[PDB]
Amino acid sequence: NLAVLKLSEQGVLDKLKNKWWYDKGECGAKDSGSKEKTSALSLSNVAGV
Amino acid sequence: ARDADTKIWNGMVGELVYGKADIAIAPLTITLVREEVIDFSKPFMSLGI
Amino acid sequence: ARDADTKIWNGMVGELVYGKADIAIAPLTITLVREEVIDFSKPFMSLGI
Ligand SMILES: NS(=O)(=O)c1cc2c(cc1Cl)N[C@H]([C@H]1C[C@H]3C=C[C@@H]1C3)NS2(=O)=O
């Protein structure tokens, strides 16, 4: 009871949670969600015209 | 969970109820039906369904 | 909180320590040093700064 509150006070829980959830961003959208590609227009876009 | 009609807590509950295991640092959820047989510290990580 | 250099709890926590109150249903944050003088239940509502 006195021990877990020390880890909550000193951010050790935050550090462990960061280590085991956020440092292992692996798959796709977390990494590549903030990048940019310009374009290249294909025919599948313009067909109803 | 407990057994019907015999109250036999199996699993990680009965390891602490029946004097088998000494402590359980594990993903265990504080309920109403678990405080009567074992005790919990202050919660260290929040979640939901 | 405690006073500087005297450890004299003013406010509401002193009302529980010095026998003047009985219980405190209140917006009260579970810290470390409040655990060593007065007992807390499980948390009912979670927040952050
Ligand atoms: N952001 S989190 O889920 O990983 C998380 C969740 C919790 C933490 C600490 C962290 Cl890092 N400590 C709190 C405790 C601190 C104090 C206040 C309630 C408890 C006492 N319990 S909690 O609310 O379960």
Ligand SMILES: NS(=O)(=O)c1cc2c(cc1Cl)N[C@H]([C@H]1C[C@H]3C=C[C@@H]1C3)NS2(=O)=O
């Ligand atoms: N979403 S919230 O902050 O208002 C909130 C926060 C909490 C609630 C209920 C609510 Cl609605 N109950 C939990 C307790 C209920 C059970 C499960 C964990 C604890 C036991 N404490 S809590 O995590 O402090």
